[PDB]
Structure 1
Amino acid sequence: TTHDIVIAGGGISGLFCALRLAEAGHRLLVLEAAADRWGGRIETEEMDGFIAEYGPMRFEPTLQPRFAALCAELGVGLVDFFGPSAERGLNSLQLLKRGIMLIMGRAPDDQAWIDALTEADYMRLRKHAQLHGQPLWAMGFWNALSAQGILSKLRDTGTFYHMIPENLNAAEWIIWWLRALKTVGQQLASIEGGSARLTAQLLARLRSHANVTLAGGHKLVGVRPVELGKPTLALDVATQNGAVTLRTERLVLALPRLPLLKLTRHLPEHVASQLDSVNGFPMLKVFFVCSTPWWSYGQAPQQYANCMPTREIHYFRRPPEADADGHGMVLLYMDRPSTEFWRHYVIDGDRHDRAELDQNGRIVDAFALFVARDVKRAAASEESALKLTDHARRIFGDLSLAETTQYIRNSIITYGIRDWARAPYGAANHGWQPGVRSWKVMEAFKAFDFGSGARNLHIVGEAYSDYQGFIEGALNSAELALATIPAP
């Protein structure tokens, strides 16, 4: 065949491009490597009636305006989330804010200065802000915080996801934190009836657009200019059937770093040379649904780290105004190196493009043992962070740990695991690297070509965005490229 515009990748950014480009009236095609699914890192499975987000769960719409706007324009609402909470002059909580504000030269409690910062200011910071003579775009976040007259000590033990041991671009993670440290963005909200709800609504308005053919099961595996000097692109697309060959005047790669690296030979050196301007962090989620929970409503998230190979362990029960069975659900949410523990419980090598539910008992076998220890210890202490129901407090007192194991192992109705470090994602999210001038990459990536000046290839997505980690970045990224695509 032949098409005006191909879009490789049907993730949030792939599709926000497939929308705005339809609304200006182009003949779009959306290749998407996955047969049945759409929205990539957006994953919401229903597990014994619980909404289990294998991908994003909450959002800060005040911070992520363009998210709200794609939510609004699509009829997606946001149920505000009200869920549970959690060496001298250096005596506070988290408050890397001290570290940042020292670097920026302000008072370590100058929260007005922080709340007044614009994107325009963030750009001025990233380009021009220095620390001990060095630009911050050239430094580790970890190094800038450890400098003469900053911190140390540095607690990665404790804290949320600040990517200290990954040592990201100082400027870009000073920027990122100065954002989430504004007074707003405490407004925390789920998406009504799942996060994948947003995927659906975007296809339901992307079906009522005539000039859009959505083509699941299609994976871009090649790109050549047809003739030297000319803008016509040859796309090798492998699919279910077999190895088709599309042609287009404009290809949009809505792909994170790992797919792009698998395409690296088929890309201009000047672009392919920079795909390593970001690192993909792995994250891994495990969900267990328990018949007979040991925790009440409002049991706080813990930071198990030791007790379990996990970072966070999150706790869910059905609303107390329902509870048709009284069941509950546990999220093990983990980064490096806990990810390496669980990685190996995906039974299918070769392919892992979505959660594996109820396919390895060994995942429960290891969840059981780890919790079994902790809930014999929590009965006694009572000053343990594990609330523990009266029913559970007693019955555990009596069972021989080896049986507390089995009680929990039996208790599991359904369980699932998503290892986001696996192809074709290779990461839950990405981070700029020390040395990188993000703005040089984002400009090069938004629009490029094989050497005609055609400006008819694009990269879009979170990975090389100005708001990494969030759908907002994926959206900012889509726009940057949209602006370089004229009407038909």
Structure 2
Amino acid sequence: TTHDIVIAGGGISGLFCALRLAEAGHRLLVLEAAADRWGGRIETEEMDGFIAEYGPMRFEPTLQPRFAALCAELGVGLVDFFGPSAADLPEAERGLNSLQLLKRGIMLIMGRAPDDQAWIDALTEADYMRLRKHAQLHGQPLWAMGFWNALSAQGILSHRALVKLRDTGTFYHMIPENLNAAEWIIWWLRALKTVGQQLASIEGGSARLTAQLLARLRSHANVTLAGGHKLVGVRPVELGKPTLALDVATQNGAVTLRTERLVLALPRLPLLKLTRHLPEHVASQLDSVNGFPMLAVFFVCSTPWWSYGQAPQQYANCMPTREIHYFRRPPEADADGHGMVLLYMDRPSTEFWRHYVIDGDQNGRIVDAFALFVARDVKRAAASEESALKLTDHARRIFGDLSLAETTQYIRNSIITYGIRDWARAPYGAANHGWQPGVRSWKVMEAFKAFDFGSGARNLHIVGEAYSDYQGFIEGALNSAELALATIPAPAQ
């Protein structure tokens, strides 16, 4: 079968392109490799009555207008999230938490006063574009440097400030790979705006965005949705002509398709798997970004050791979990006193394994390692008297007495259900992506938004977060999508 447009990938960028293109009148097929679900890195589970988000959970709608507008268009309500969160240095640098020390370094790199919040607040995408293209540090373009290198530069931080960023986990958790300085500076500048505070979540779980989008698409007769179909090959039907032949694996076999246009709504790893089928000038740029790891771990406990309102805790260097969130039922509507713990572990999973997992299912060994981790935290709280972890007095005396081994066993045994998502694993290969130093991102984005095998047809496109100007977010996926959608002509009469 021939299709006028084929979109490979049913994550948010792919489905959004399907929507815009359907609305413009094109006839199109969306291929999604997973047999069981749509939405890609947007994944929500109901776990013992709790909403577990393996991907996005909270949003900042003022920083993410395309997302906000899409939600509004699809009748996806956003609900304000009010829940809780969070000496030896030189004079200038004493005072500041890690974020503020980072900000200072950035502000100084950009030749600004650290307190210059009005400039941060004023910066637009066009400013950001001039920053990546033109900003330099000691004569070197920032797009050419690692962000560690940038932060380490003459006149930016004291030698000790650098050490302190190391100890707070800045380089272990937040900036794990020393990626593109220009791109990191832009991203932090945006995130440091005043307006960047009002937090929301999606009513009914993040996957309600996907479900609404799917419902809309199902109402457009010029859209076909095919789950369980993975693009595994593409080439021109004939060299020098635009029409593409596609090879598609299904559950039970394969299908060969023809199309005039192919949207690859895919991140780095799935494109790497297609590398030999892609035009050379695109293939050779697939490593312009790297993938960031994330393991999202959820477990529901029959006998939680924390109360309603417990705030999330962030961890520092050498603690493989970036962050632990705690959840309880609303204390009026609390049938069972069950709680849920969400742990984000942002180090390479083979490093986590080699340090924390007893070899003698992998899932069960990982939960065990996490029970021990949590046990140490509970013991240190019980012994501490002032702790960010507000234990009860039931908990406080039990855990005070119990050994570490007994605390581990107790936590382990209280787990009635768990889920683990390792985003680094095939087929995703990453939670999100970042530009390499030495890459001019605007050139890659320009090449990827429309390209071909040399005929000039410009009828292949890459869209998604991975190679966007706003990595880490749905907003990035949507910006990348719009870049390519602006290159696609309205359908033939």
Bin for the TM-score computed over the shorter chain:
over 0.9
CA contact (8 A) 1:6 1:250 kept: yes
Counterparts of 1:278 and 1:468, CA distance in 2: 10
1:100 aligned to which of 103, 106, 109: 106
Alpha-carbon spacing, 1:421–1:472, altered in 2? closer, same or farther (3 Å) = same
Counterparts of 2:128 and 2:304, CA distance in 1: 46
Counterparts of 1:283 and 1:339, CA distance in 2: 12
Instruction: State yes or no: 1:406 paired with 2:404.
Output: no
Alpha-carbon spacing, 1:193–1:346, altered in 2? closer, same or farther (3 Å) = farther
Question: Normalization by structure 1: what TM-score?
Answer: 0.93
Runs of 5+ in structure 2 lacking a partner?
Answer: 86-91, 159-163
Alpha-carbon spacing, 1:389–1:91, altered in 2? closer, same or farther (3 Å) = closer
Alpha-carbon spacing, 1:338–1:240, altered in 2? closer, same or farther (3 Å) = closer
Counterparts of 1:339 and 1:10, CA distance in 2: 29
Alpha-carbon spacing, 1:387–1:464, altered in 2? closer, same or farther (3 Å) = same
CA contact (8 A) 1:9 1:255 kept: yes
Q: Deviations 1:79-100 (Å, cap 9, x if unpaired)?
A: 1111222965877754311011
Counterparts of 2:22 and 2:63, CA distance in 1: 27
Of the structure 1 ranges 425-434 and 302-311, higher mean CA displacement relative to structure 2 is found in 302-311
Alpha-carbon spacing, 1:347–1:392, altered in 2? closer, same or farther (3 Å) = closer
CA contact (8 A) 2:93 2:101 kept: no
CA contact (8 A) 1:307 1:370 kept: no
Counterparts of 1:142 and 1:404, CA distance in 2: 39
Q: What residue in structure 2 maps to residue 335 of structure 1?
A: 346
Secondary structure at 1:31 match in 2: strand
Secondary structure at 2:42 match in 1: coil
How far 1:347 sits from its partner (Å)? 14
Runs of 5+ in structure 1 lacking a partner?
Answer: 350-357
Q: What residue in structure 2 maps to residue 352 of structure 1?
A: none
CA contact (8 A) 1:94 1:159 kept: no
CA contact (8 A) 2:324 2:344 kept: yes
Q: Deviations 1:379-420 (Å, cap 9, x if unpaired)?
A: 222123221012211222343443322221221110111010
How far 1:366 sits from its partner (Å)? 2.3
CA contact (8 A) 1:347 1:360 kept: no
Q: Deviations 1:117-151 (Å, cap 9, x if unpaired)?
A: 11111111111111101111111111111111111
CA contact (8 A) 2:376 2:404 kept: yes
Q: Deviations 1:214-251 (Å, cap 9, x if unpaired)?
A: 00000001011001100010101011131210100000
Secondary structure at 1:333 match in 2: strand
How far 1:345 sits from its partner (Å)? 11
CA contact (8 A) 1:345 1:362 kept: no
Alpha-carbon spacing, 1:164–1:361, altered in 2? closer, same or farther (3 Å) = closer
Alpha-carbon spacing, 1:480–1:306, altered in 2? closer, same or farther (3 Å) = closer
Secondary structure at 1:237 match in 2: strand
Of the structure 1 ranges 386-395 and 338-347, higher mean CA displacement relative to structure 2 is found in 338-347
CA contact (8 A) 2:450 2:484 kept: yes
Of the structure 1 ranges 213-222 and 317-326, higher mean CA displacement relative to structure 2 is found in 317-326
Counterparts of 2:462 and 2:317, CA distance in 1: 40
Counterparts of 2:356 and 2:38, CA distance in 1: 25
Secondary structure at 2:51 match in 1: strand
Alpha-carbon spacing, 1:139–1:164, altered in 2? closer, same or farther (3 Å) = same
CA contact (8 A) 1:311 1:334 kept: yes
How far 1:305 sits from its partner (Å)? 5.2
How far 1:306 sits from its partner (Å)? 7.6
Of the structure 1 ranges 35-44 and 384-393, higher mean CA displacement relative to structure 2 is found in 384-393
Secondary structure at 1:442 match in 2: helix
Secondary structure at 2:78 match in 1: coil
Alpha-carbon spacing, 1:209–1:109, altered in 2? closer, same or farther (3 Å) = same
Alpha-carbon spacing, 1:3–1:262, altered in 2? closer, same or farther (3 Å) = same
Q: Deviations 1:345-404 (Å, cap 9, x if unpaired)?
A: 99999xxxxxxxx98433333223232333233222212322101221122234344332
Q: Deviations 1:10-33 (Å, cap 9, x if unpaired)?
A: 000000000000000111100111
CA contact (8 A) 1:176 1:467 kept: yes
Alpha-carbon spacing, 1:421–1:364, altered in 2? closer, same or farther (3 Å) = closer
Alpha-carbon spacing, 1:308–1:166, altered in 2? closer, same or farther (3 Å) = closer
Alpha-carbon spacing, 1:240–1:27, altered in 2? closer, same or farther (3 Å) = same
Q: Give me the identity figure in percent.
A: 100
How far 1:271 sits from its partner (Å)? 0.8
Question: Normalization by structure 2: what TM-score?
Answer: 0.92
Alpha-carbon spacing, 1:401–1:170, altered in 2? closer, same or farther (3 Å) = closer
CA contact (8 A) 1:283 1:339 kept: no
Q: What residue in structure 2 maps to residue 353 of structure 1?
A: none
Alpha-carbon spacing, 1:208–1:331, altered in 2? closer, same or farther (3 Å) = same
Alpha-carbon spacing, 1:206–1:345, altered in 2? closer, same or farther (3 Å) = farther
Of the structure 1 ranges 39-48 and 302-311, higher mean CA displacement relative to structure 2 is found in 302-311
Of the structure 1 ranges 431-440 and 83-92, higher mean CA displacement relative to structure 2 is found in 83-92
How many aligned positions are there?
Answer: 480
1:217 aligned to which of 213, 223, 228: 228
Q: Deviations 1:265-301 (Å, cap 9, x if unpaired)?
A: 1011111111111000111111110111101112222
Secondary structure at 1:246 match in 2: strand
CA contact (8 A) 2:270 2:428 kept: yes
Alpha-carbon spacing, 1:203–1:359, altered in 2? closer, same or farther (3 Å) = farther
How far 1:9 sits from its partner (Å)? 0.3
Counterparts of 1:113 and 1:450, CA distance in 2: 44
Of the structure 1 ranges 145-154 and 458-467, higher mean CA displacement relative to structure 2 is found in 145-154
More helix by share: 2
Q: Deviations 1:145-177 (Å, cap 9, x if unpaired)?
A: 111111144346255997433111111111111
Secondary structure at 1:416 match in 2: strand
Alpha-carbon spacing, 1:299–1:432, altered in 2? closer, same or farther (3 Å) = same
CA contact (8 A) 1:307 1:374 kept: no
How far 1:37 sits from its partner (Å)? 0.5
Counterparts of 2:97 and 2:343, CA distance in 1: 29
RMSD (Å) for aligned C-alpha atoms: 2.8
